[PDB]
Write a protein that binds this ligand. Structure first.
Ligand SMILES: *[C@@H]1O[C@H](CO)[C@@H](O[C@@H]2O[C@H](CO)[C@@H](O[C@@H]3O[C@H](CO[C@H]4O[C@H](CO)[C@@H](O)[C@H](O)[C@@H]4O)[C@@H](O)[C@H](O[C@H]4O[C@H](CO)[C@@H](O)[C@H](O[C@H]5O[C@H](CO)[C@@H](O)[C@H](O)[C@@H]5O)[C@@H]4O)[C@@H]3O)[C@H](O)[C@H]2NC(C)=O)[C@H](O)[C@H]1NC(C)=O
Ligand SMILES: *[C@@H]1O[C@H](CO)[C@@H](O[C@@H]2O[C@H](CO)[C@@H](O[C@@H]3O[C@H](CO[C@H]4O[C@H](CO)[C@@H](O)[C@H](O)[C@@H]4O)[C@@H](O)[C@H](O[C@H]4O[C@H](CO)[C@@H](O)[C@H](O[C@H]5O[C@H](CO)[C@@H](O)[C@H](O)[C@@H]5O)[C@@H]4O)[C@@H]3O)[C@H](O)[C@H]2NC(C)=O)[C@H](O)[C@H]1NC(C)=O
Ligand SMILES: *[C@@H]1O[C@H](CO)[C@@H](O[C@@H]2O[C@H](CO)[C@@H](O[C@@H]3O[C@H](CO)[C@@H](O)[C@H](O)[C@@H]3O)[C@H](O)[C@H]2NC(C)=O)[C@H](O)[C@H]1NC(C)=O
Ligand SMILES: *[C@@H]1O[C@H](CO)[C@@H](O[C@@H]2O[C@H](CO)[C@@H](O[C@@H]3O[C@H](CO)[C@@H](O)[C@H](O)[C@@H]3O)[C@H](O)[C@H]2NC(C)=O)[C@H](O)[C@H]1NC(C)=O
Ligand SMILES: *[C@@H]1O[C@H](CO)[C@@H](O[C@@H]2O[C@H](CO)[C@@H](O[C@@H]3O[C@H](CO)[C@@H](O)[C@H](O)[C@@H]3O)[C@H](O)[C@H]2NC(C)=O)[C@H](O)[C@H]1NC(C)=O
Ligand SMILES: *[C@@H]1O[C@H](CO)[C@@H](O[C@@H]2O[C@H](CO)[C@@H](O[C@@H]3O[C@H](CO)[C@@H](O)[C@H](O)[C@@H]3O)[C@H](O)[C@H]2NC(C)=O)[C@H](O)[C@H]1NC(C)=O
Ligand SMILES: *[C@@H]1O[C@H](CO)[C@@H](O[C@@H]2O[C@H](CO)[C@@H](O[C@@H]3O[C@H](CO)[C@@H](O)[C@H](O)[C@@H]3O)[C@H](O)[C@H]2NC(C)=O)[C@H](O)[C@H]1NC(C)=O
Ligand SMILES: *[C@@H]1O[C@H](CO)[C@@H](O[C@@H]2O[C@H](CO)[C@@H](O[C@@H]3O[C@H](CO)[C@@H](O)[C@H](O)[C@@H]3O)[C@H](O)[C@H]2NC(C)=O)[C@H](O)[C@H]1NC(C)=O
Ligand SMILES: *[C@@H]1O[C@H](CO)[C@@H](O[C@@H]2O[C@H](CO)[C@@H](O[C@@H]3O[C@H](CO)[C@@H](O)[C@H](O)[C@@H]3O)[C@H](O)[C@H]2NC(C)=O)[C@H](O)[C@H]1NC(C)=O
Ligand SMILES: *[C@@H]1O[C@H](CO)[C@@H](O[C@@H]2O[C@H](CO)[C@@H](O)[C@H](O)[C@H]2NC(C)=O)[C@H](O)[C@H]1NC(C)=O
Ligand SMILES: *[C@@H]1O[C@H](CO)[C@@H](O[C@@H]2O[C@H](CO)[C@@H](O)[C@H](O)[C@H]2NC(C)=O)[C@H](O)[C@H]1NC(C)=O
Ligand SMILES: *[C@@H]1O[C@H](CO)[C@@H](O[C@@H]2O[C@H](CO)[C@@H](O)[C@H](O)[C@H]2NC(C)=O)[C@H](O)[C@H]1NC(C)=O
Ligand SMILES: *[C@@H]1O[C@H](CO)[C@@H](O[C@@H]2O[C@H](CO)[C@@H](O)[C@H](O)[C@H]2NC(C)=O)[C@H](O)[C@H]1NC(C)=O
Ligand SMILES: *[C@@H]1O[C@H](CO)[C@@H](O)[C@H](O)[C@H]1NC(C)=O
Ligand SMILES: *[C@@H]1O[C@H](CO)[C@@H](O)[C@H](O)[C@H]1NC(C)=O
Ligand SMILES: *[C@@H]1O[C@H](CO)[C@@H](O)[C@H](O)[C@H]1NC(C)=O
Ligand SMILES: *[C@@H]1O[C@H](CO)[C@@H](O)[C@H](O)[C@H]1NC(C)=O
Ligand SMILES: *[C@@H]1O[C@H](CO)[C@@H](O)[C@H](O)[C@H]1NC(C)=O
Ligand SMILES: *[C@@H]1O[C@H](CO)[C@@H](O)[C@H](O)[C@H]1NC(C)=O
Ligand SMILES: *[C@@H]1O[C@H](CO)[C@@H](O)[C@H](O)[C@H]1NC(C)=O
Lengths: 102, 444, 125, 125, 125, 444
């Protein structure tokens, strides 16, 4: 179906800097890409839906922007509550996932 | 130099939602599930004005006319069922045996001869009656039977005089509103339509309740039309509109009786009772060649979206209720559920008749309401039926491990897509007659 | 009645201004009985709101009404030819909808109100 | 309010034309609640249709309105005395109902529309 | 819309006469559905009754309308300063409500009716 | 010299009565006794205009908004109760014994364990069921028990999904009408108000149904307010509005179950069944000191009307139904009736907590209609509740032989006074936009 490539596969960054994760689809998917956060031992939690809108209750430091084939997830500040694996998703397909690290 | 000038009657509109009244010719009868309490007489002169130099954005997937039709049809079903016999004294133990009459091997176990005690016109007297019930209407009380809805819902007999035959209904806008029709013949129901007209009412739309197949609908003018809210999303149904229809021949061969049982002071229960002659399975025939050329056209149009070299597979429904796992419909007054496993069973590589067995049911929850069911009375005689398959509702299989092949299965259940196939070309707009523009004229 | 309704929707604004009466005549005509009655009542009060707007300006009983509000080039800087011979009323509405309320406010702020008061006073001398 | 309502119905048209306000004031005021509401709404929209017809001509807010449509002797060849001093309005309506739509069409075709456009243009010079 | 509604209710009549449009814009917008519909229909026909009263006088499409009815000192013998600079409209209504019907009758008896007939006749010469 | 001039839009109004629509935010839920069939969404911008130089006569005791709210609340109760389970097969003989569970001495005899025969989903089969019923719901058939309303009224179960929690409702006027609000802080609800404003809708008024105490109402801004149609008439209730509220802590300590019994084809009866743990009396606590200072303020304000040297006595209700002889209310879904004999028991000469025992009831005739009662289903768990006592409804004792003392007792029952306490400051007026005045201007 629609293949996805999510990069970087593993990222290590110190507090304060920005984290930019990129998902590349296999074709035009309009804006129907979602970004989820999964802490270890917990279910994924949706942060970005439709690639730009922010789920209610999410801090504003999480943001997403993209279209067509290319999408980007931006976390402006790596606050200590945020260490988790981040996944992109189009339809049934889930990204390979990236784990931030301190 | 220039001054504000006010114009009234300006031809400007906006997108809006409103309540649309229904026009209908309503000839005949001297007893219609719809045009008796809600709609009004038709228009002798259906006037359509072509709006030249007008390109208008349409969206069949955010059309409020579809939602209005859904609510209207549900409410009209409820209103038609309100003044009829409540069948609450029929939730009793039923002693059932198999039918001793000559029964074909396919129909063995489908029908049960059930004896039970019933109320009479006098409340202090009881009657021993017997009736024929389909096996799909009858649940064993333990591992003595009972109707299927007795645990969950109360049951109301449908009035036999009221007929379930769809009649066309035209959806008309009130004053200050207009209905824009997209006249483009290649339109997939979303985006700009260059050829637009305005109409007083929609075309005659038969409220046909069916699953997996659009019966007695409109036909595409040029080619088979594939429409989907998101063709890449497998969770979204694919509406297929044919350019040439496929005739479907349905029948229940059983010569059936209608026994009247006086259950109350003026209330009657209409049971099946007996069958004159042999007993055979109800079924629907379609032409094998016609179905073949229609499926070839559907594959040709699906490959536009899913690639030219991909293999298009037609498989039967994955699961669900009997309404969605089968072509469920109603013509002749009885409710058919036909196994379409023979319709959808093919693999199309990029390079006689079919008989569908049908099971009848008398206890129906049409719109899955809570605490409400309907008993469909039996029809006297042999019911036959001829319809035009004019489209399909499909669902693509997700999570495909093989990227070369795509699998499409029948779908349905949500009838908002049944009339999205009819209301795709219409759009309600709201006239803004007041405009302001610069002119050289100045008030004294 | 319905003939020609919105037929000049794609015409130029100058050409569509000669057909205002076809679009002005068409603005005035159980639970479903209540639905139809609600639709009819809504149409009536909408028509009356539009007529009230026309009447609080000097435009009562008129489909074309010249005013004393000057045109501001902050609303549109096109010359009359681009407006009345090259554009349609739908495009003009899309262009001018952001200022429509300012224009309406100016129409009822000073021109009709001060005009009326000045005609009150000119009927003294 | 109701006093004198239709009292001049059998009067001459000339004499009944002095009582137009008694017949103009009287055009504006469970399942049976819906019936009464339907009656009231119908009366309202009928009155508004008549006022719209008056307004698309030059006859807004007027019970007697002179126009620029000439009288055609194909509609009636009687002289003013037979009409306004010998006939009643009911007889006149019976005589002229076959042409009423032609007269209405002429009233809104050219006279008010071309007048309005010409007043649009006379407000330039 | 609702801003300033009745804000000049305690102002002088002269000062409250500059705010007539805020109080004029605000007169036009299951069993409880029938209740709301009855309220809306009643508001509509009331507004139309007031507009009909204005129109059978010469005051159609006007919030201030000068007439040809002389003021009688049997209705109020105050000088303009006491009325328009010392009194409010509520006090004036309390003072003048006993004669209001006489004034309305005079407004539609002779002035608008004889005016209209005289304009019918002046359009002959 | 002077001529008639017609003005339209004149700011003049008269006293009138009209039907007021209700605005409500109606957030939450995805089941409200009120805002589901009658009222409409709220207003983002509540606009209030202060009418300067305006003195307006108000009368809370001839306010038609109160009557409209009474009719609306009764009708909305009836409409909410219409689509629910009719409990007519529960009017049968009940074999009842005392509860064997650990019961405190106060709660001895209050609860009865009753076994009875009930209908099943199949009409030809019966079930032996048992339920816990409060003693106030159960009448002995002879000097074998029966529910209390079986002699007089049919009973309908309240839908458990529908919640009895008051939500605020704003009463809004239609076009051509206005709501004038009296902004004076010392206003007793009758006579001229100098500080007047106009509002689109009233404030958020919770339709709290209670007797003897106004819960979750508005509070006086400056001082305790004593209001009465005639303070000299003992037949007229005295509405007391507090300036500081008294918190009230109510609870039913019983850990309760809700057993579901299928009485019909889709109908369910929700009985109590069993209690997990000890059984204790339901009760309401108020602060003794807070009640003391509030009653001192009430006495101080009553002495303004009844003399400065008179002795003000607070005694409990003289008699009536359980609704009026007790603080009757409903929060948590269950209907409490609390003995306020400890609240009102004092003598004030001119110079810790209180616990109120509460009895629960499930069969309620809220508005004393004929032939209609409601069964309140039990609530699973422990129900607690916190409210603001914001006022009282009192009745003065007449025919006093002693002129030095005045006695005031709790009152209520007529809930038109419960919402008179909220709608006292509002008045519906009717805009008269047409005026005629002299000016020097003359028409040409
Ligand atoms: C798609 O669209 C298709 C075209 O509309 C539909 O097919 C149509 O289906 C309807 C409903 O079954 C068919 O209507 C029936 O037609 C018969 C009468 O029509 C003609 O039949 C005879 C020859 O076939 C002819 O001699 C007749 O004179 C007539 O011209 C009947 O089967 C039936 O009539 C019955 O209609 C009443 C309502 O159903 C019923 O009350 C009457 O019978 C009852 O009452 C009488 C009198 O009281 C008693 O004597 C009876 O015992 C009984 O109690 C009456 O008999 C009905 O009209 C229609 O013909 C058919 N059209 C075509 C072209 O095939 C599809 O159904 C649609 N598909 C879907 C899925 O909706
Ligand atoms: C005067 O005004 C006061 C303030 O408004 C009122 O007090 C209020 O009273 C209401 C009604 O009892 C209280 O609302 C309840 O509050 C609880 C939920 O709120 C919070 O509670 C938890 C901590 O206390 C917290 O963890 C929760 O997350 C939540 O924040 C519940 O008791 C109750 O919730 C129930 O609401 C539904 C409707 O009642 C009910 O259907 C639900 O339970 C049912 O359904 C679920 C799911 O199907 C099942 O799991 C259950 O078994 C059951 O079938 C749901 O549980 C309710 O919301 C309110 O909290 C309280 N406020 C305050 C500040 O005390 C007074 O009552 C007013 N006085 C008068 C006389 O009217
Ligand atoms: C369903 O079972 C019922 C019985 O519960 C069947 O009807 C009964 O059938 C018997 C045997 O055919 C009938 O007896 C016969 O009646 C005729 C006259 O009608 C008589 O000439 C014969 O000698 C014999 O007695 C019986 O009358 C009839 N009814 C009852 C109440 O027993 C029914 O046919 C069964 N239906 C099917 C579809 O199998
Ligand atoms: C759907 O298609 C099937 C299959 O073609 C049709 O069944 C066929 O129906 C005909 C006409 O009734 C049968 O002919 C008759 O059969 C019996 C037994 O011999 C007898 O009454 C007559 O002598 C005559 O031959 C035919 O046998 C039967 N074939 C099969 C395989 O079942 C069916 O009628 C069609 N249904 C429609 C259009 O509704
Ligand atoms: C849709 O838009 C087209 C333009 O894209 C409009 O076409 C114009 O139509 C008018 C009226 O028919 C034409 O005027 C005529 O033209 C010729 C000279 O070219 C002359 O013989 C006549 O005197 C007359 O004026 C005009 O030429 C034509 N212009 C073009 C094609 O550029 C059309 O009217 C629009 N249709 C609508 C809104 O219904
Ligand atoms: C019903 O029709 C009759 C005619 O058939 C109308 O009678 C006319 O009534 C007027 C008004 O009362 C009379 O005018 C008066 O006449 C005399 C001179 O004849 C004079 O003293 C007065 O100055 C006044 O003008 C008129 O003569 C009379 N004409 C007849 C009988 O030929 C009557 O008005 C109609 N009534 C209605 C419509 O209510
Ligand atoms: C309520 O009634 C009072 C009178 O009792 C009104 O007060 C008047 O308000 C106007 C407008 O603000 C004042 O005019 C101003 O006055 C001074 C000279 O005194 C000058 O600086 C300004 O040019 C301006 O004209 C006026 O003096 C004042 N008159 C008094 C107190 O006698 C008030 O407007 C009413 N408010 C309403 C209806 O909202
Ligand atoms: C109201 O009375 C009913 C009886 O009408 C009480 O329920 C019944 O209580 C008996 C004795 O506790 C139960 O028997 C016991 O059952 C358990 C299993 O549940 C078993 O392990 C014991 O050996 C014993 O047999 C009985 O099952 C139960 N139900 C019936 C239908 O008899 C009920 O508790 C009483 N409620 C109150 C609040 O007192
Ligand atoms: C209303 O006020 C009464 C009286 O103060 C409260 O009753 C008291 O509640 C507390 C808390 O539950 C009880 O303490 C506990 O009691 C038992 C027995 O010792 C035990 O579970 C714990 O060890 C703990 O001490 C206290 O005994 C009890 N006092 C009395 C006299 O009954 C009641 O809770 C208040 N209700 C409200 C605010 O709803
Ligand atoms: C379905 O029924 C229609 C009629 O409703 C059948 O059409 C007829 O078919 C026969 C046999 O070929 C022809 O002789 C007739 O001329 C056709 N028309 C009519 C009006 O009878 C059709 O054959 C059926 N289709 C099947 C069984 O596939
Ligand atoms: C089945 O489909 C055919 C083909 O569309 C229908 O026959 C057409 O009916 C329309 C009705 O307006 C006519 O204009 C066409 O000329 C007809 N075409 C042909 C080829 O005959 C037929 O009515 C449909 N049958 C049912 C039962 O809906
Ligand atoms: C009634 O309940 C309220 C809470 O709903 C209680 O208020 C709390 O009281 C305790 C004990 O003094 C304090 O520690 C808390 O801070 C108070 N607030 C809250 C939010 O819990 C109140 O005490 C109760 N009143 C009684 C029993 O008189
Ligand atoms: C009980 O009363 C208190 C005091 O009035 C309420 O708390 C107030 O709530 C309002 C809501 O608009 C706030 O504006 C005030 O600031 C609050 N005051 C204080 C002192 O906290 C409280 O909400 C009431 N409780 C109930 C259950 O009605
Ligand atoms: C009756 O039918 C059932 C299936 O419904 C079958 O299992 C059973 O054997 C049949 N009994 C007979 C023919 O006696
Ligand atoms: C429908 O057609 C429009 C152009 O009119 C196109 O942009 C859109 O992608 C089409 N939808 C699908 C599902 O192909
Ligand atoms: C036109 O609009 C601007 C703001 O866009 C305003 O400042 C200016 O004064 C306006 N001009 C006139 C002539 O009113
Ligand atoms: C009068 O009517 C006739 C047709 O009856 C028409 O031919 C003629 O032109 C009309 N006369 C005028 C002056 O309009
Ligand atoms: C004024 O009113 C009196 C009656 O109050 C009336 O007799 C008199 O003629 C009137 N004056 C005028 C000038 O109309
Ligand atoms: C049952 O309770 C009643 C009061 O309702 C009491 O009179 C009777 O003695 C009790 N019987 C017992 C405990 O056996
Ligand atoms: C209410 O206040 C008014 C003055 O505003 C006063 O005349 C009236 O007597 C008061 N009512 C009572 C019961 O004291």
């Amino acid at each position: 179906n629609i293949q996805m490539t999510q990069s970087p596969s593993s990222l290590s960054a110190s507090v304060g800097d920005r984290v930019t994760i990129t998902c590349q689809a296999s074709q035009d998917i309009s804006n129907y890409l979602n970004w989820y956060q999964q802490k270890p031992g917990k279910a994924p939690k949706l942060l970005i839906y439709d690639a730009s809108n922010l789920e209610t209750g999410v801090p504003s430091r999480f943001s997403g922007s993209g279209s067509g084939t290319h999408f980007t997830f931006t976390i402006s500040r790596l606050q200590p509550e945020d260490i988790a694996t981040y996944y992109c998703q189009v339809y049934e397909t889930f990204g390979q996932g990236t784990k931030v690290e301190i | 130099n220039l001054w504000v000038t006010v114009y009234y009657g300006v031809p400007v509109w906006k997108d809006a939602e409103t309540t649309l009244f229904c026009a209908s010719d309503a000839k005949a009868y001297e007893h219609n599930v719809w045009a008796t309490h809600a709609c009004v007489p038709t228009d002798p002169n259906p006037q359509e004005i072509h709006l030249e130099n007008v390109t208008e954005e349409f969206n069949m997937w955010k059309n409020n006319m579809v939602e209005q039709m859904h609510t209207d049809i549900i409410s009209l079903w409820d209103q038609s069922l309100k003044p009829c016999v409540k069948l609450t004294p029929l939730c009793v133990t039923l002693q059932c045996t198999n039918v001793t009459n000559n029964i074909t091997d396919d129909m063995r176990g489908e029908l049960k001869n059930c004896s039970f005690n019933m109320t009479t016109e006098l409340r202090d007297k009881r009657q021993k009656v017997h009736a024929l019930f389909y096996k799909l209407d009858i649940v064993p009380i333990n591992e003595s039977y009972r109707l299927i809805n007795c645990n969950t819902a109360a049951i109301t007999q449908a009035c036999p005089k009221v007929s379930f035959e769809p009649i066309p209904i035209h959806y008309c806008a009130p004053a200050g509103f207009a209905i824009l029709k997209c006249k483009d013949k290649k339109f997939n129901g979303t985006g700009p339509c260059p050829s637009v007209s305005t109409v007083q009412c929609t075309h005659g739309i038969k409220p046909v309740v069916s699953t997996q197949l659009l019966l007695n609908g409109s036909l595409a003018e040029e080619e088979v039309m594939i429409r989907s809210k998101d063709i890449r999303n497998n969770a979204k149904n694919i509406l297929v509109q044919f350019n040439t229809p496929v005739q479907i021949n349905c029948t229940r061969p059983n010569n059936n009786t209608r026994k009247s049982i006086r259950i109350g002071p003026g209330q009657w229960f209409y049971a099946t009772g007996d069958i004159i002659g042999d007993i055979r399975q109800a079924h629907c025939n379609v032409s094998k060649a016609t179905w073949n050329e229609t499926l070839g056209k559907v594959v040709k149009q699906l490959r536009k979206h899913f690639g030219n070299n991909t293999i298009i597979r037609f498989a039967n429904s994955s699961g669900g209720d009997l309404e969605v796992t089968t072509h469920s419909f109603n013509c002749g007054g009885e409710f058919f559920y036909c196994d379409t496993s023979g319709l959808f069973n093919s693999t199309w590589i990029s390079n006689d008749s079919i008989t569908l067995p049908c099971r009848i049911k008398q206890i129906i929850n049409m719109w899955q309401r809570i605490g409400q069911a309907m008993y469909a009375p039996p029809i006297q005689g042999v019911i036959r039926c001829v319809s035009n398959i004019t489209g399909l509702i499909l669902t693509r299989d997700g999570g495909s491990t093989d990227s070369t092949t795509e699998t499409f299965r029948p779908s349905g259940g949500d009838m908002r897509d049944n009339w999205r196939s009819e209301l795709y070309k219409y759009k309600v707009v709201k006239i803004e007659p007041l405009g302001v523009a610069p002119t050289r004229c100045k008030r004294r | 009645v319905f003939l020609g309704f919105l037929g000049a929707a794609g015409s130029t604004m100058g050409a569509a201004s000669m057909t205002l009466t076809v679009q002005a005549r068409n603005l005035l005509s159980t639970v479903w009985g209540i639905k139809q009655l609600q639709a009819r009542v809504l149409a009536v009060e909408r028509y009356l709101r539009d007529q009230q707007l026309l009447g609080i300006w000097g435009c009562s009983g008129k489909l074309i009404c010249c005013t004393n509000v000057p045109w501001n080039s902050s609303w549109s800087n096109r010359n009359l030819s681009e407006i009345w011979d090259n554009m349609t009323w739908l495009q003009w509405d899309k262009e001018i909808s952001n200022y429509t309320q300012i224009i309406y406010g100016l129409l009822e702020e000073s021109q009709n109100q001060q005009e009326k008061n000045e005609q009150d006073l000119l009927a003294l001398d």
